[PDB]
């Protein structure tokens, strides 16, 4: 039994979001939330909102108890990048990269 959520086109570059995504992988949902609360990184609040969305999915739509759930998968894919011309330097380009954050949570049973 697995619930998931994705957040699409989040405006943080994927290298910066995979760093904190490596912390919560394979842990329990409660201690995952605690790890996300005690890291000062720009993407801990985004990821925490996706994780709370997936736990809400599991409780509401599949009637899983939210105290047994572990974070089964957590990953970040590249979304579409936006190209900006930096005027501040000399006419060289800057891409705003964006990402897709997927979290899936489960009770380990079948």
């Amino acid at each position: 039994m697995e619930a998931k959520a994705v957040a699409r086109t989040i405006r943080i570059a994927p290298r910066k979001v995979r760093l904190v995504l490596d912390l919560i992988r394979g842990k329990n949902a409660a201690e995952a939330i605690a790890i996300l609360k005690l890291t000062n990184k720009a993407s801990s609040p985004v990821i925490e909102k996706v994780l709370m969305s997936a736990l809400a999915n599991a409780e509401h739509n599949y009637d899983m108890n939210t105290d047994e759930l572990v974070v089964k998968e957590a990953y970040a894919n590249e979304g579409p990048t936006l190209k900006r011309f930096r005027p501040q330097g000399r006419a060289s380009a800057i891409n705003k990269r964006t990402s897709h954050i997927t979290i899936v949570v489960s009770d380990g049973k079948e």
Binding site: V20, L23, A34, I35, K37, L38
Partner: protein, 48 residues
């Protein structure tokens, strides 16, 4: 300033093995609230 050869995938990822985040502290909240930073009355639910 320039690289003669491009670096491969394997050399890039060998360079990134120390480039990662350490696990935080977590002295737990015994009175009330969320788990707070170690040796803190942290600003979100601190009951140290």
């Amino acid at each position: 300033a320039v690289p003669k050869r491009r670096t491969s995938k394997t050399r890039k990822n060998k360079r990134r093995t120390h480039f990662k985040i350490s696990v935080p502290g977590m002295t737990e909240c015994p009175n009330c609230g969320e788990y707070k930073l170690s040796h803190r009355v942290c600003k979100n639910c601190g009951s140290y």
